[PDB]
Curated annotation (Swiss-Prot):
Consequence recorded when altering A158T: In LADD1; strongly reduced kinase activity
Location in the cell: Cell membrane; Golgi apparatus; Cytoplasmic vesicle
Organism field: Homo sapiens
Residues recorded as bearing Phosphotyrosine in the entry: Y6
Residue window of the full protein shown: 461 to 764 of 821
Description of how the protein assembles with itself and partners: Monomer. Homodimer after ligand binding. Interacts predominantly with FGF1 and FGF2, but can also interact with FGF3, FGF4, FGF6, FGF7, FGF8, FGF9, FGF10, FGF17, FGF18 and FGF22 (in vitro). Ligand specificity is determined by tissue-specific expression of isoforms, and differences in the third Ig-like domain are crucial for ligand specificity. Isoform 1 has high affinity for FGF1 and FGF2, but low affinity for FGF7. Isoform 3 has high affinity for FGF1 and FGF7, and has much higher affinity for FGF7 than isoform 1 (in vitro).
Functional description taken from the UniProt entry: Tyrosine-protein kinase that acts as a cell-surface receptor for fibroblast growth factors and plays an essential role in the regulation of cell proliferation, differentiation, migration and apoptosis, and in the regulation of embryonic development. Required for normal embryonic patterning, trophoblast function, limb bud development, lung morphogenesis, osteogenesis and skin development. Plays an essential role in the regulation of osteoblast differentiation, proliferation and apoptosis, and is required for normal skeleton development.
Ranges of residues in domain Protein kinase: 21-277
Coiled-coil regions listed: none
Protein name: Fibroblast growth factor receptor 2
Effect of substituting R142T: In a lung adenocarcinoma sample; somatic mutation
Amino acid sequence: AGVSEYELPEDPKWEFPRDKLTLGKPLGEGCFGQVVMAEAVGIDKDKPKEAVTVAVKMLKDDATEKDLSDLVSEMEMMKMIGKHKNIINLLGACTQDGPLYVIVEYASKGNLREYLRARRPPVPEEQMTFKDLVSCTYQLARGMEYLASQKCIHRDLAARNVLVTENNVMKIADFGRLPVKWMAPEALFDRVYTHQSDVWSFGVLMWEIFTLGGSPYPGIPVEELFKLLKEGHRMDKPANCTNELYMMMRDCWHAVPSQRPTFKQLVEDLDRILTLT
Ligand SMILES: *C[C@@H](C)C(=O)Nc1ccc(-c2c(-c3ccc(Oc4nccc(C)n4)c(F)c3)c3c(N)ncnc3n2C)cc1
């Protein structure tokens, strides 16, 4: 069944006391798995005696043996991936003697799509500015650079799967029923994911950011979306956008993958713009 009754879970140093954990509300519908806001204690290793809000990925009610094996493989992946500023990083675990919980960082601010829609100038309205936007895009690109470094692939790369903590710092999620609009022609037609497809997905994400939570390719049915893309139909420029950034977006949307801007090239360019705030 769910707990290890005939399973081989090793003992790591990552594991967190099954006791101090205490689960809470589940956040959103889990495309990557049922995740729950927990209130862990003494996992920072420097701030005991005070609760810290985290997210834990338990198993679903109709979980199968393969679901648990996939969860443990994903846990090991996270353990190998390493630490980066703008990524949902592993913080703890619950492996031996009980059900499997995977502790990942918690983001106070909701999804990026909802956060930007709620940070729109005259849904609440905390004033938002282009300077903050450019910082967001650069942070996301650096995170994606690191994520590509470990040769990982992003199932659904979109603002609907990017998070923000109380510190207003970007973090990726999903780096380990389909978003057709966020998929490159090569990936939408050959159904093969590649870094160039990740560049296209990142460019679509940038468009979603620049419009503060807009649906890409609005009014375009999915059936003819590929056909329109094949004829060289790329999205228009966002309203409150600059032409240089839009040209970077279109380059990320280049039909040929070879010429598309490398993830490092995008990070360099974004740093260049950020210096001119
Ligand atoms: C599919 C779609 C409708 C959707 O809603 N996706 C979605 C669900 C939940 C959150 C989310 C998270 C969060 C927690 C854990 C993981 O697992 C993960 N993260 C990175 C890499 C890998 C391989 N797995 C998530 F992807 C997302 C979360 C957290 N940790 N804290 C606060 N709020 C949170 N939300 C809303 C995001 C998107």
